[PDB]
Design a protein around this ligand. Structure first.
Ligand code: CLA
Ligand code: CLA
Ligand code: CLA
Ligand code: CLA
Ligand code: CLA
Ligand code: CLA
Ligand code: CLA
Ligand code: CLA
Ligand SMILES: CC1=CCCC(C)(C)[C@H]1/C=C/C(C)=C/C=C/C(C)=C/C=C/C=C(C)/C=C/C=C(C)/C=C/C1=C(C)CCCC1(C)C
Ligand SMILES: CC1=C(C/C=C(\C)CCC[C@H](C)CCC[C@H](C)CCCC(C)C)C(=O)c2ccccc2C1=O
Ligand SMILES: CC1=C(C/C=C(\C)CCC[C@H](C)CCC[C@H](C)CCCC(C)C)C(=O)c2ccccc2C1=O
Ligand code: SF4
Lengths: 151, 73, 139, 42, 69, 80, 742, 104
């Protein structure tokens, strides 16, 4: 048995079919991620990705930022995470302007209208996920420490 | 680094980075407008010269000012 | 004359050295050749492949890759039956080499000389003479 | 003595090493018997 | 220190057993060469008895270590 | 593209044409030299600028001259 | 009996004719010089045998005799080390007072005032202090007199004469055929059993009959000339049974398998001898006996002439799974037909072994009184780290020469090489990403700390007194090794090394070894080590994997292993050969090994070496500043380079003034190298044209037309002078510093 | 348990090749095969008179009693578990090789 084969039956394309690349488990994960999942509008793809990324962004800023030992650390962690999100949304916006020409179609990410929808969703989701992480950390003492409240 | 190592090594690295970006999921959604290439031969000479010269100026300026300040004499 | 797209490719297990997205959106090169044997050769982009007895066909990203393979087949397996094509994503196939049926190192009638300058290289014009002028430095 | 061995001793690296060793050697001997000559004594 | 014993017939018994064990194993597992009367030669016998003195020495020392002796 | 020129000192040795890795050069008929042929550069859009032709040339100063110019995908040697 | 001796008799005539014809060995060089490039090309390609000859037989014969020539040089070198110890040394005085006398075996002539180099090393002697650790070797051997050192010198000279004779004989009189050299099973059987196994067994016999009694008497305190000569231990079995009573029983316990009788002299003590600060020589004797046993056992694995044994080809071809195609098929043919493939493997392994030697010899000091001779410990650690790094980079050089020259795709279809070459982009892009990740998160921690300490924010630093990056896995491994005696190594009495934890071993009030604690600075510099090793692997591996072809140059194998470029086109292909990745990877090897030896020197001075005052407190050489100062670059610059260069720069007028001069001279050579590295050949050829014009004007132009060095030779000269200057600057700095303070 | 020793879901270790991972059989057999020899007792302070498997199981129990607190650096938990896991991984690897490849 051989686990490595040419990519999509083509021996001369610059890729290989390896278990990491093209196993059934890998195919299931890639196909079900919001970027690639079927039946999702570009805006909804942006929302789901945004919620995930904004939620984890708050934590490193809060625990390791300059104001970490202060009593305003969570507020600083939220503002710095929000500041990063605002910069990232601008990165998405400028990419959309140069990369895609204007066309009628709006149902795909790699279209000017579609990329704009993805940016709108990602902005709202990142603000929403960062806000959710803020509420949870503000109220639950386990999250404020590293779980160190139990010891 | 710009003065000792020359173009061919770096162009071959950059070709392995172009391959890896195109094959990585969630990352190949983003595409360059300009094909990444290694710096040119003359450009690399200029960049190494600028880095060398700037380091020369900044190191001596820090020394001549701080040693004279710290000594006052 | 035209590329028969159905020619079987030489057996190959794949590599990362093959062509990338620029081949499917800008241009691709193809090479065909006849082999009297089912023998192993080296791919320009990687490891080893096996050319099948009869007609073989490859796809590469660069013209230099097709010609580096052509040089190899001629030098080792004495295969002078190689034809190199350019293929555009529109489907247009452009025959490339040998351009008029005869190798470039052999003279052929009906070839018109391009780039030939009537004087020797030391007789060119100084840059100052042709400054702010469209006149070419080759005399 | 063998003419090919003498043709080997006439090669540039052998003559260079021997001549500069002889040269270095009489500088060393001259500074052994007549040391610290900062000036031509006059 | 692991406890070893002066040579007795028990030590000999272990050695003899291991040597015979390896002679039969060598008749079975030596891939390049009347169960013992086909193709049995001096290099085969000398190899199976060399492994017998290695297996036997290890077995004697281990059984001395644990108390079986 | 790069600009490749052949000057009339070419002795028609065909060495530049054989050394070119991208089939830029070919031999055409010419009465100027003894060999009856001169090098030609009909396909400079494919010239990568390697200057293997100039290395191959045996005339005292090169009959074939490569002048590196504007860069394209072909002349940059980019397989991507 | 297909393993047989076959020899051509009188192959090559012993003639001086080709001596007189420089360049005789190649068709290009044999027609004589026309430009100065010929001279350089003569030296560059001379030992490249497979570039002169087509036949593997003549190549193999040349290699075998050149290995005899190298052995003749090594034996002459050893004989000279023994003769200088016998004739020009204070060895006899050092034997009486190993802790007071400083070893010295080199005396200078008085010529231009250079006799200041004959410093007062002790024992009524003046000379250059030597740091190679030969005195401790000789005491471990049980030499005890200059007379025995003269006999060792004569034995070295006789071996040197026999090796140069054997090289001449086996090239010119009786040269083996190719089928003799292509006996890999026989060669491995003899080199495991015969060379390594009987080497260990014979040395174990010497340790037991000479080193153990003589060193037991020395460590008891007996004067060296009061000690019986080494053969009186061999004969008078009663005198040997006095020191080691197990000898009263002779060899009956060995043969009857009653081995626990021999526990007097075959111990498993561990730790260090308290008197000498070295390993127990009873342990080294047991170690060499056990290694001898299993090297002789291992040299019986492979099949030679009687059917028992393994075929290495069958072992290799049988190991293949579902990820790796045909598996190790074709590797036997590679390694029995290519000398470069064998040299690539053997150089990488020999370099790795030298790096292991460097770590193991400082941590488990094997010789008596070498642990408290700090100049020797620093010298042999630094020396074997440099030998290791060079040999590893030559392993990748000869992997590239194999791939360019000896690699044939027809015989390597779908095996392990074919598959590595067919996913080399995935390998090089993942290594490239690791090197970026690991430079950011190792050196970037240092830059974060420079910035925080400079900004007044010491609570924001990665340090022990701040945000901590502790090496918990290394600390845990140290814990296990201190718990091992009596627990997981129950019959051991002490730990393998006190570096893991435990006591302070002091000899002559100087620390032999003591626990080397790991903190945030140790976490940081270990990730610096992993970063520099990963980058060196990236450069050398990228050179090997892309040696034949790239996306850039599709026919790189036709240009060879060593070519300067393929022109200014494709944007520029400067330094595209496999040789140019060895050239670039020797810089990163230099960077890696320089940081390793700096880490060792500062950590040992700061936290291990020093003096044990009353109450058991230890005063280290630099007073424990590593922990709080090796976390910033400014700390390394100020507290290590600046503070410790005081001895080299203040050495003028003393016996260490030679180190001050070599410090400056190596700074010079290093800077001079940058003339060759930052420059290009075309400038220098055009400058040489005007110089040639001035010679033509005076009618004195040479007939060997001067040329600027080749592009490759400009790179090779720049790299040679760079390494010579940088290593020389560190050599002088390390030696003057540790001779003054340690 | 991506696929068990049965033709359930159409699993493919790679692009087009189905391959039955025998996660039940290999995991169970590797677990038991490693554990029974590992029971071998030893009067060593790390084991404490039990075997490696029994001591590892006991270490989980003693540290689980102090549930929030982690085991200390000198605690025998870290040595016992690392050796047990290393052996289990090795016998799982060898078991997967033997069963999937030799099929008998
Ligand atoms: C192999 C390593 C080695 C090294 C590095 C040294 C190094 C040294 N030795 Mg030691 N020595 C060695 C081995 C070694 N020795 C051995 C094996 C012996 C035993 C015979 C000795 C015995 C010995 C004695 C007895 C003495 C030294 C001395 C010296 C010192 C000065 C040597 C000198 O300037 O004479 C230079 C002498 C010359 C005649 C100059 C020769 C220069 C020529 C031109 C070199 C040319 C080589 C040639 C061109 C090669 C090609 C051959 C040709 C056919 C082309 C120096 C520290 C001296 C010392 O320490 O005094 C305190 C001293 O008296 N050595
Ligand atoms: C027991 C057998 C034996 C031993 C000891 C060696 C030893 C050696 N071989 Mg090997 N060799 C052997 C069998 C053996 N070979 C066989 C059977 C073959 C054919 C397949 C080869 C083919 C072979 C090749 C092709 C090469 C070697 C090389 C070497 C040298 C490796 C470098 C080194 O470590 O030397 C330094 C270590 C030493 C110990 C130096 C010792 C010098 C002598 C020769 C060792 C033996 C002396 C003697 C037996 C001891 C007498 C003891 C007495 C006082 C009681 C080393 C001398 C390489 C070499 O350098 O060639 C010269 C090399 O290229 N050998
Ligand atoms: C790893 C070691 C290392 C390295 C690589 C560097 C690298 C550098 N240092 Mg730093 N430095 C270091 C360690 C190091 N330093 C340490 C440990 C200290 C002590 C804390 C310093 C202190 C230091 C100071 C104080 C200065 C540097 C300077 C420099 C720069 C020299 C630039 C150049 O091209 O030289 C060019 C070299 C020269 C122009 C002269 C070389 C110095 C000689 C010894 C003095 C001059 C001699 C005389 C005038 C000329 C003789 C003429 C000839 C005919 C004989 C460069 C950035 C200098 C700088 O920025 O240069 C502008 C500078 O001012 N460094
Ligand atoms: C009935 C047979 C028998 C018995 C009871 C033993 C028993 C033993 N052997 Mg022996 N052995 C045997 C056969 C046997 N062996 C055979 C056939 C060989 C092949 C020659 C060996 C070779 C051998 C060696 C080479 C060593 C042992 C050692 C040991 C002991 C410790 C192993 C340990 O816990 O390490 C645990 C270590 C680990 C890393 C595991 C975690 C153990 C008492 C070792 C020992 O210490 O003996 C004093 C040792 O070094 N054995
Ligand atoms: C350019 C090469 C070079 C040079 C000049 C030196 C110079 C020195 N070495 Mg080093 N060494 C080197 C390469 C080199 N080494 C390499 C590549 C290795 C790795 C094998 C070592 C391993 C090594 C050890 C282990 C020791 C030295 C020691 C010494 C010193 C005393 C020399 C002596 O008499 O040896 C005497 C050597 C011994 C008495 C013991 C050597 C024992 C080893 C295990 C022998 C192995 C030989 C075997 C054939 C090699 C097999 C390699 C393997 C991969 C198959 C001196 C500073 C000694 C030292 O530090 O003394 C203070 C010392 O103990 N060297
Ligand atoms: C190649 C290595 C080597 C060599 C040449 C020797 C050589 C010798 N050994 Mg040593 N020996 C070695 C390795 C070696 N040994 C090792 C590795 C061990 C550890 C197992 C020993 C342990 C050992 C002991 C315990 C004794 C010798 C003795 C002897 C002498 C043998 C006399 C005899 O047969 O009566 C031996 C006595 C009988 C009753 C039989 C002889 C000088 C004997 C001797 O004369 O001591 C000085 C002795 O008693 N050897
Ligand atoms: C066992 C070790 C070993 C062996 C047998 C070889 C053998 C070979 N190598 Mg490899 N190599 C090795 C180790 C080894 N190398 C190591 C450790 C490295 C890393 C640096 C390399 C890197 C390397 C490269 C990059 C290349 C080779 C090449 C070669 C071949 C040509 C050798 C030649 O003609 O040089 C002739 C020898 C010289 C010109 C000597 C000069 C070298 C330096 C600059 C002089 C030494 C300075 C000195 C030690 C200090 C001076 C003191 C100063 C203060 C004055 C030959 C097959 C070349 C090749 O083409 O192979 C096909 C090649 O391109 N090797
Ligand atoms: C650690 C436990 C272990 C070990 C040592 C072996 C060893 C072996 N098995 Mg077994 N197997 C195991 C677990 C193990 N298996 C389990 C758990 C299962 C059930 C799922 C199977 C099911 C199985 C089948 C169905 C078959 C085998 C077969 C084999 C043999 C050759 C194929 C192979 O796996 O190559 C392994 C090769 C070796 C072990 C020898 C190479 C020597 C090196 C040093 C390997 C060392 C690896 C590792 C470090 C050892 C770890 C030991 C321990 C600390 C965990 C070999 C004797 C086949 C065979 O020959 O049939 C009898 C066969 O048909 N095995
Ligand atoms: C675990 C694990 C094990 C095995 C290996 C492994 C897979 C790699 C690893 C996984 C690791 C990883 C990478 C795990 C990563 C896990 C991550 C990043 C999870 C993110 C979760 C985001 C949430 C819950 C956002 C919620 C936002 C909400 C509810 C909206 C709120 C708001 C809206 C808009 C509505 C109004 C109110 C507000 C509050 C304003
Ligand atoms: C490192 C290196 C590279 C790789 C370097 C690259 C690709 C430079 C890319 C720059 C990165 C993308 C950002 C750095 C830009 C500057 C830090 C800031 C730019 C913005 C201001 C200048 C306005 C080469 O391409 C090269 C080519 C020829 C000889 C030597 C070398 C060489 O040494
Ligand atoms: C200086 C220099 C030269 C010219 C260097 C020359 C001509 C070397 C000079 C050597 C003279 C002729 C002899 C002097 C040699 C030394 C006294 C000692 C040499 C020791 C070994 C050669 C044996 C180049 O050719 C070059 C080429 C490519 C990049 C950089 C450079 C470069 O920097
Ligand atoms: S090489 Fe120079 S001379 Fe020979 S053909 Fe090409 S151009 Fe004419």
């Amino acid at each position: 048995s051989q686990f490595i084969k040419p990519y999509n039956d083509d021996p001369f394309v610059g890729n290989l079919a390896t278990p990491v690349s093209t196993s059934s488990f890998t195919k299931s994960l890639l196909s079900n991620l919001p970027a690639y999942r079927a039946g999702l509008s570009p805006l909804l793809r942006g929302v789901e990705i945004g919620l995930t990324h904004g939620y984890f962004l708050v934590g490193p800023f809060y625990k390791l930022g300059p104001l970490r030992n202060s009593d305003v650390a969570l507020l600083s962690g939220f503002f710095s995470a929000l500041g990063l999100i605002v910069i990232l949304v601008a990165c998405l916006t400028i990419y959309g302007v140069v990369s895609f020409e204007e066309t009628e179609a709006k149902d795909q990410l790699q279209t000017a209208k579609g990329w704009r929808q993805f940016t709108s969703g990602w902005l709202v989701g990142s603000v929403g996920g960062a806000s959710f992480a803020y509420i949870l950390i503000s109220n639950i003492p386990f999250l404020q420490t590293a779980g160190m409240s139990m010891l | 680094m710009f003065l000792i190592s020359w173009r061919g090594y770096w162009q071959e690295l950059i070709e392995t980075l172009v391959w890896a970006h195109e094959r990585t999921p969630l990352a190949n959604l983003v595409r360059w407008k300009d094909k990444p290439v290694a710096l040119s031969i003359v450009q690399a000479r200029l960049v190494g010269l600028i880095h060398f010269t700037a380091g020369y100026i900044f190191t001596y300026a820090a020394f001549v000012i701080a040693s004279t300040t710290g000594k006052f004499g | 004359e035209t590329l028969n797209l159905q020619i079987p490719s030489p057996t190959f297990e794949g590599s990362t050295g093959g062509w990338l997205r620029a081949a499917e959106v800008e241009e691709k090169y193809a090479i065909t050749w006849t082999s009297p044997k089912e023998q192993v050769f080296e791919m320009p982009t990687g490891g080893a492949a096996i050319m099948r007895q009869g007609e073989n066909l490859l796809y590469l990203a660069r013209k230099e890759q097709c010609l580096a393979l052509a040089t190899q087949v001629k030098n080792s397996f004495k295969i002078t039956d190689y034809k190199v094509y350019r293929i555009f994503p529109s489907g247009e196939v452009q025959y490339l080499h040998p351009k008029d049926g005869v190798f470039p190192e052999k003279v052929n009638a009906g070839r018109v000389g391009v780039g030939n300058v009537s004087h020797s290289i030391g007789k060119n014009l100084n840059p100052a003479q042709i400054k702010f002028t469209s006149k070419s430095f080759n005399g | 003595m063998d003419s090919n061995f003498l043709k080997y001793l006439s090669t540039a690296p052998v003559l260079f090493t021997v001549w500069l060793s002889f040269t270095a050697s009489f500088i060393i001997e001259a500074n052994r018997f007549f040391p610290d000559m900062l000036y031509f004594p006059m | 220190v692991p406890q070893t014993v002066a040579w007795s017939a028990k030590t000999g018994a272990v050695m003899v057993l291991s040597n015979i064990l390896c002679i039969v194993a060598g008749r079975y597992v030596i891939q390049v060469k009347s169960g013992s009367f086909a193709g049995f030669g001096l290099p085969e016998l000398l190899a199976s008895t060399s492994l017998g003195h290695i297996v036997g020495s290890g077995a004697i020392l281990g059984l001395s270590y644990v108390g079986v002796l | 593209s790069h600009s490749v020129k052949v000057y009339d000192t070419c002795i028609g040795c065909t060495q530049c044409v054989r050394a070119c890795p991208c089939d830029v050069l070919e031999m055409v008929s010419w009465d100027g030299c003894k060999a009856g042929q001169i090098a030609s550069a009909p396909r400079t859009e494919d010239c990568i600028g390697c200057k293997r032709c100039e290395t191959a040339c045996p005339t005292d100063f090169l009959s074939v001259r490569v002048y590196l110019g504007g860069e394209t995908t072909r002349s940059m040697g980019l397989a991507y | 009996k297909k393993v047989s001796i076959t020899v051509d008799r009188d192959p090559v005539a012993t003639s001086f004719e080709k001596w007189a014809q420089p360049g005789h060995f190649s068709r290009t060089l044999a027609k004589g010089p026309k430009t100065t490039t010929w001279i350089w090309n003569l030296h560059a390609d001379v030992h490249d045998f497979d570039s002169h000859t087509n036949s593997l037989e003549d190549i193999s014969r040349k290699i075998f005799s050149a290995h005899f020539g190298q052995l003749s040089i090594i034996f002459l070198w050893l004989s000279g080390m023994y003769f200088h110890g016998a004739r020009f040394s204070n060895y006899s005085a050092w034997l009486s007072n190993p802790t007071a006398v400083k070893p010295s075996a080199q005396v200078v002539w008085p010529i231009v005032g250079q006799e200041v180099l004959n410093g007062d090393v002790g024992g009524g002697f003046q000379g250059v202090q030597v740091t190679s650790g030969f005195f401790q070797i000789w005491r471990s051997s049980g030499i005890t007199s200059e007379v025995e050192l003269y006999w060792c010198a004569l034995a070295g000279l006789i071996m040197s004469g026999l090796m140069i004779f054997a090289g001449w004989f086996h090239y010119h009189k009786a040269a083996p055929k190719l089928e003799w050299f292509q006996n890999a099973e026989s060669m491995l059987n003899h080199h495991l059993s015969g060379l390594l196994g009987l080497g260990c067994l014979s040395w174990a016999g010497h340790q037991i009959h000479v080193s153990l009694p003589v060193n037991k008497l020395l460590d008891a305190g007996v004067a060296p000339q009061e000690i019986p000569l080494p053969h009186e231990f061999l004969v008078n079995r009663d005198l040997m049974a006095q020191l080691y009573p197990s000898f009263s029983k002779g060899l009956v316990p060995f043969f009857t398998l009653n081995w626990s009788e021999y526990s007097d002299f075959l111990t498993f003590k561990g730790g260090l001898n308290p008197v000498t600060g070295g390993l127990w020589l009873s342990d080294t004797a047991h170690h060499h006996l056990a290694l001898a046993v299993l090297f002789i056992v291992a040299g019986h694995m492979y099949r030679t002439n009687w059917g028992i044994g393994h075929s290495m080809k069958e072992i290799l071809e049988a190991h293949k799974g579902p990820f790796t195609g045909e598996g190790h098929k074709g590797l036997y043919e590679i390694l029995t037909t290519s000398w470069h493939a064998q040299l690539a493997i053997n150089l990488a392994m020999l370099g790795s072994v030298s790096i292991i030697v460097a770590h193991h010899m400082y941590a488990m000091p094997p010789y008596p009184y070498i642990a408290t001779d700090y100049p020797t410990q620093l010298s042999i650690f630094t020396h074997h780290m440099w030998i290791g790094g060079f040999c590893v980079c030559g392993g990748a050089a000869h992997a590239g020469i194999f791939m360019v020259r000896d690699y044939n795709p027809a015989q390597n279809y779908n095996n392990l090489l074919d598959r590595v070459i067919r996913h080399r982009d995935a390998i090089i892009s993942h290594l490239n990403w690791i090197c970026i990740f690991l430079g950011f998160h190792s050196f970037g921690l240092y830059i974060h700390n420079d910035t925080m300490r400079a900004l007044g924010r010491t609570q924001d630093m990665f340090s022990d007194t701040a945000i901590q990056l502790k090496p918990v896995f290394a600390q845990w491994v140290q814990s296990i090794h201190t718990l091992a005696p009596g627990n997981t190594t129950p019959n051991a009495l002490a730990t393998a090394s006190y570096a893991f934890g435990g006591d302070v071993v002091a000899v002559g009030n100087k620390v032999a070894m003591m626990p080397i604690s790991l903190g945030t600075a140790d976490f940081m510099v270990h990730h610096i080590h992993a970063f520099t090793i990963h980058v060196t692997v990236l450069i050398l591996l990228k050179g090997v994997l892309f040696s034949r072809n790239s996306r850039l140059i599709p026919d790189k194998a036709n240009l060879g292993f060593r070519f300067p470029c393929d022109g200014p086109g494709r944007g520029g292909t400067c330094q595209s050969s496999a040789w140019d990745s060895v050239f670039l990877g020797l810089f990163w090897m230099y960077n890696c090994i320089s940081v390793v030896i700096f880490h060792f020197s500062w950590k040992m001075q700061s936290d291990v070496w020093g003096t044990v005052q009353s109450d058991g407190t230890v005063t280290h050489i630099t007073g424990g500043n590593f922990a709080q100062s090796a976390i910033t670059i400014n700390g390394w610059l100020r507290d290590f380079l600046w503070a410790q260069a005081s001895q080299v720069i203040q050495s003028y007028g003393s016996a260490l003034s030679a180190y001050g001069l070599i410090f400056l001279g190596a700074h010079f050579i290093w800077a001079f190298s940058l003339m060759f590295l930052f420059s290009g050949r075309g400038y220098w050829q055009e400058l040489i044209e005007s110089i040639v014009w001035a010679h033509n004007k005076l009618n004195v132009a040479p007939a060997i037309q001067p040329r600027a060095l080749s592009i490759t030779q400009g790179r090779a000269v720049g790299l040679a002078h760079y390494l010579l200057g940088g290593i020389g600057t560190t050599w002088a700095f390390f030696l003057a510093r540790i001779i003054s303070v340690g | 348990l991506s696929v068990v020793a049965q033709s359930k879901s159409d699993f493919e270790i790679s692009d087009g090749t189905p391959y039955t991972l025998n996660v039940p059989l290999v995991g169970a057999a590797s677990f038991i095969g490693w554990v029974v020899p590992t029971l071998l007792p030893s009067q060593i302070a790390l084991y404490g008179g039990k075997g490696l498997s029994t001591a590892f199981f006991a270490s989980i129990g003693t540290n689980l009693a102090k549930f929030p607190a982690p085991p200390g650096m000198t605690d025998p938990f870290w040595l016992l578990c690392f050796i047990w896991h290393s052996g289990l991984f090795a016998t799982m690897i060898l078991g997967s090789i033997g069963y999937n490849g030799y099929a008998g």
